[PDB]
RNA sequence: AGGACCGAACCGACUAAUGUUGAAAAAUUAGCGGAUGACUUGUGGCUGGGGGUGAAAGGCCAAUCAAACCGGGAGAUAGCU
RNA sequence: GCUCGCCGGAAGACCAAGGGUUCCUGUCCAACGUUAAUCGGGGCAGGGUGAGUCGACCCCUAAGGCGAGGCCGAAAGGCGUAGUCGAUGGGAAACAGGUUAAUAUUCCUGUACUUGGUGUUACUGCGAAGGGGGGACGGAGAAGGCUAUGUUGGCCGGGCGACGGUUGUCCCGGUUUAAGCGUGUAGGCUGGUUUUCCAGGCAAAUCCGGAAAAUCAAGGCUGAGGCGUGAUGACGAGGCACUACGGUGCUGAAGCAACAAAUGCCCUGCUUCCAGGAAAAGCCUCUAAGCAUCAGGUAACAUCAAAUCGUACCCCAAACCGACACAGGUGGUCAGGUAGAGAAUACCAAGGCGCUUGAGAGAACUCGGGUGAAGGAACUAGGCAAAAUGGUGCCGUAACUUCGGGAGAAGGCACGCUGAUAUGUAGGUGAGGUCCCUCGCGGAUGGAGCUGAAAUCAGUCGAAGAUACCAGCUGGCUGCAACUGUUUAUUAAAAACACAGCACUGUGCAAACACGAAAGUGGACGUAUACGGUGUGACGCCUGCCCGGUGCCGGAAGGUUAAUU
RNA sequence: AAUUCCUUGUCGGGUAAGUUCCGACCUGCACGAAUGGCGUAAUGAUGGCCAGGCUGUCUCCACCCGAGACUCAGUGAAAUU
């Protein structure tokens, strides 16, 4: 549910917040947990590579189970979690044989419910399956790029992909972004989508929760001198250039992909 | 008013200790300079 | 409940007077702002000079910054005093 | 030595960092001390730092550093695996009293505790560079139960007043005692025991996790304080002999109760919220390869061992950082009385100081302050400076508004002391007695004693009763930025910078992009409800016309065009 | 008008008297719609203007309490030439 702050003082009249009763209230399960050490945006050389990183809060790392290639034994989740290092949520699965792991948590997936994967496995949501056996025109999340290698597309809070069409070890899938990619007919997925998709409701309301992320604030670049950035400065506020980036690109409609490795896997790009 | 020197035992030896400048080839260039001078001390050890 | 309210410790520096071979190479006295937070503080660690860092003034990098300090090319060159 | 003045959340007391003999005693006065100097943190000589329990070393790890092979690079060299280092964090054990000119939880007296080696005896499944448990963790808020500590009464010793009164409801002082061991309370958390079975924990497992039955609800764990013992002891106000009047032996009464009460303890607890809150070892358990009349394990007793280094003194300052015996700067711990909401402010206790040039005079002028006839901003670039307002309770309060505000709007009235209601009220605390009981640190009843607001009526003193210190000036119109925040250390704090919100554009993951001759690293252990760049800047109503020029995104016939041949 | 040269534009309000301030007019030297246009409660050690209270700011200065200045004893500088 959404609810809205009232204006008992400034810096909460515009506040919207996001708040779900299920979710459990205690500490994790610990076995599965990692610490988290924060970076600054500095690689090994000590040099700021990406700008406006840096405090936050502490964070502990949760082992996701993203392969999910337990296949064969049923299992039952046991409760909702809140997971400060992705914006979707997770579910605490516990297997018939007695093993525990976490999995993202989809759209319609609640305490008590029964999920399976492999083959076998039904045409359920929370169910995984290679996506040879999946009827085209259906809708999946946690696409595998390669077999094996784990699930690397339609990960966020709502997003989803679906399938689009089969003819031999290939099928083709369209991507949240429109892009049409083309894929291996042996990658597994899982049936559903990622169901938390209040989260782009939220509103801040104040600079102090931006702080709290850990995003550190962003100088604009007509405001600073010639010598430190293209833009540079003058008498008032002339901006009399197109506009650049640092270092002199364009950015403004510029294209940068320059792979060319693969460019036999897209079709559609985007637009 | 708090002014630039603010002394500290364990940051000195770590910085120009006898051992710091035996770990690098431009460190123990300092200490070849020193000796042929003839210096009495040839660090901050003691 | 709150980057909420009045106000000490603690952190800041808006006005006036004194001082200007000063008690002090930036302070003293009487008022002044914030004070549960984008807050403040002890110990250790990392980023090096056409480079670093910068809620952005050309600010800061050991009382030195529109290119730090030390040694060397070096007795640079000076149609000028 | 007797008076006077100043600090007392320090200008008192104990440490870390840093310094390195400045500490105690004798002796000297050239230089050093902003003056003299018999004095000194000055010169010279001698003396002083005692640990199985305090700290370091030592065992374990964070950020990070180094790094056998290895990968990469003209040389130098860069990055990194297995490993090894690195506190600001985790890990066994002691308290009170006495004593030196100078040290003590280190010496002495009394009474305790911890971890290892060896031997004896009794009973025995032992074994890890492996598995599991534990260690192990956030912000805010609300109570209840306690202690440190303070006040009064009782008790014990002493006192009868330099000037009117003072044998009583009078005056002064004291009334202190640890660790350890035994008891397990206020209160917090969790349902126990037995049997059978199993795709999990890299192999194994009696341990952990999972499944199905049977049988009972009392099982266990954690836990301040109080009480007993320790203690026929120690300490103890004042006396009495030594007493170079610097100080020592001996002796030594009372040693209880009530009430008030922390920011400290129970509490790593409980309730609640979103931004979702370290690691490893010691410690407790499970077995593998092995070894089994051996070797090892558990308990009792005896005996031995616990090394080495630091310990003086200053430490908000004359000893540290500022060239100085310099109105400067510097982290942690302890927290008495009266008034008070208070760690503000005023006066005081314990304790410590009067700041290293003095003596006279009482001109102009400069500096820091007090008061003022009549007028009241006529001053000046400008009410700069100064004057003024100032507390608690009750009554009362406009335009406008995002309905929260504006608001302490503005403005008005009451405040001391004594007596009565009530020889001290409402409230809080709570003994004896009585009764109950799983008889214990228990429940019910019961009310003595102690402590103690506010209000009403009457009377009374002064010019003045929130009397001192302390302690908002208020209202009307308007430009700019929404707001809290940030900035030119040392002439600019703002209309400048950030900001939540909005829009365009790039990026399908070996992502765009950034630091690197390279390897590699950040972005991210993230995946388009995500990430980078650019402009605008809460919210409300809105954002019109132009693609010739420059840039960017597409297209493709024709013209022109490099190396090469 | 943070934008208007001519300019103290013209009319009205407030004052005994208003180049500033507030409200209208439009001849906009040289405003204008995200290098955004026009409004807006609350907030500000922000710029401009007007009142009540209060006063040595002033007409116009007078007296008093302290530290220097002056005299005696000890120690004993500086810029400049």
């Given at each position: 549910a959404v609810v809205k702050c009232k204006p008992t003082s400034p810096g909460?009249?515009?506040?919207?917040?996001?708040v779900n009763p299920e979710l459990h209230k205690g500490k994790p399960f610990a076995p599965?947990?990692?610490?988290?050490?924060?970076?600054g945006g500095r690689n090994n050389n000590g040099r700021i590579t990406t700008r406006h990183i840096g405090g936050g809060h502490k964070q502990a790392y949760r082992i996701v189970d993203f392969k999910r290639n337990k296949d064969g034994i049923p299992a039952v989740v046991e409760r909702l979690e809140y997971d400060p290092n992705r914006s979707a949520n997770i579910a605490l699965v516990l297997y018939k044989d007695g093993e525990r792991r976490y999995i993202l948590a989809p759209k319609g997936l609640k305490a008590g419910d029964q999920i399976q994967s492999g083959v076998d496995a039904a045409?359920?949501?929370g169910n995984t399956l290679p996506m040879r056996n999946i009827p085209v025109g259906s809708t999946?999340?946690?696409?595998?790029m390669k077999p094996?290698?784990?699930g690397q597309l339609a990960r966020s809070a709502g997003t989803y992909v679906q399938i689009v069409a089969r003819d031999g070890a290939y099928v083709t899938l369209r991507l949240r972004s429109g892009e049409m990619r083309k894929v291996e007919a042996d990658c597994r997925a899982t049936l559903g989508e990622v169901g938390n998709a209040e989260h782009m409701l939220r509103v801040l309301g104040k600079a102090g929760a931006a702080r709290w992320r850990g995003v550190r604030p962003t100088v604009r670049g007509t405001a600073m001198n010639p010598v430190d950035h293209p833009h540079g400065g003058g008498e008032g506020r002339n901006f009399g250039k197109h506009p650049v980036t640092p270092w002199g690109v364009q950015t403004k409609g510029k294209k940068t992909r320059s792979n060319k490795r693969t460019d036999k896997f897209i079709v559609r790009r985007r637009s | 008013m708090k002014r630039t020197f603010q002394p500290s035992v364990l940051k000195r030896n770590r910085s120009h200790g006898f051992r710091a400048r035996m770990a690098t080839k431009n460190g123990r260039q300092v200490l070849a300079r020193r000796r042929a001078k003839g210096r009495a001390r040839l660090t901050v050890s003691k």
């Open positions: 909460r009249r515009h506040v919207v917040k996001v599965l947990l990692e610490k988290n050490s924060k970076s045409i359920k949501p999946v999340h946690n696409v595998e094996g290698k784990g | -």
